[PDB]
Amino acid sequence: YDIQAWKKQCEELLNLIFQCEDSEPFRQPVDLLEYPDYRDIIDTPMDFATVRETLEAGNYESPMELCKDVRLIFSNSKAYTPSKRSRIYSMSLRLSAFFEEHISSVLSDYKSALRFHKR
Ligand SMILES: COCCNC(=O)N1CCN(C(=O)c2cccs2)C[C@H]1C
């Protein structure tokens, strides 16, 4: 019932993600010179460094907010990829499954802790 536990859990999960080779394309903001049409397609850029920074700044209130930004990384990748058979797309899908598998208990524990708090 620890309401704050999510934060270290998410720090640990981001560490795992940074160790995953599949995260390499998603670790830094897209270079807008290198992909000059990016912002024509993507309204809200997001990357794992930004997520980690936001977390470490104390600018997430909940794991749900972190989970929304991480999912945006994957939706951005999926939207910019020209093919479902692309390398980056395939990496997105794998990393997303890994993330979703690990974030599920973080979310459940948090929501459970909050419910207990308001019981
Ligand atoms: C020669 O192969 C290069 C392959 N790389 C790419 O196509 N990209 C990098 C990933 N991406 C994204 O949307 C995001 C990067 C950060 C977070 S989401 C798509 C695109 C810019």
Residue numbers in the entry: 1316 to 1434
Task: Give sentences copied directly from the paper behind this entry.
We previously completed a crystallographic fragment screen (PDB deposition ID: G_1002162) against the second bromodomain of the Pleckstrin Homology Domain‐Interacting Protein (PHIP). However, the specific role of the second bromodomain (hereafter: PHIP(2)) is unknown.
A striking feature of the diving products is that they all have a methyl‐substituted piperazine ring. When looking at their closest lateral neighbours based on chemical similarity distance, it seems that this alkyl substitution is required to change binding orientation. A significant change in protein conformation is revealed by this novel diving binding pose: the ZA‐loop adopts a more relaxed conformation, resulting in a more voluminous binding site that accommodates the flipped products, thus illustrating that some level of conformational motion is present in our crystal system. The aromatic 5‐membered rings seem to bind mostly via hydrophobic interactions within the water cavity. In addition, the cis‐orientation of the two carbonyl oxygens was observed in the diving products whereas the lateral products displayed a trans‐orientation. The synthesis of the three diving products made use of racemic building blocks, resulting in CRMs containing a mixture of enantiomers, and the quality control protocol identified that products with the expected mass were present in the mixture. Individually, none of the diving products could be unambiguously assigned to either (R)‐ or (S)‐ enantiomer: all relevant variations in electron density were no higher than the standard deviation observed in the immediate vicinity of the protein model. In contrast, taken together, the electron densities for the three repeat observations offered consistent support for the (R)‐ enantiomer, revealed by a paired sample T‐test at the 1% level. Overall, these results indicate that the protein binding site defined by this crystal system is favourable for the methyl group oriented in an “up” (R)‐fashion and located on the same side as the compound′s cis‐oriented carbonyl oxygens.
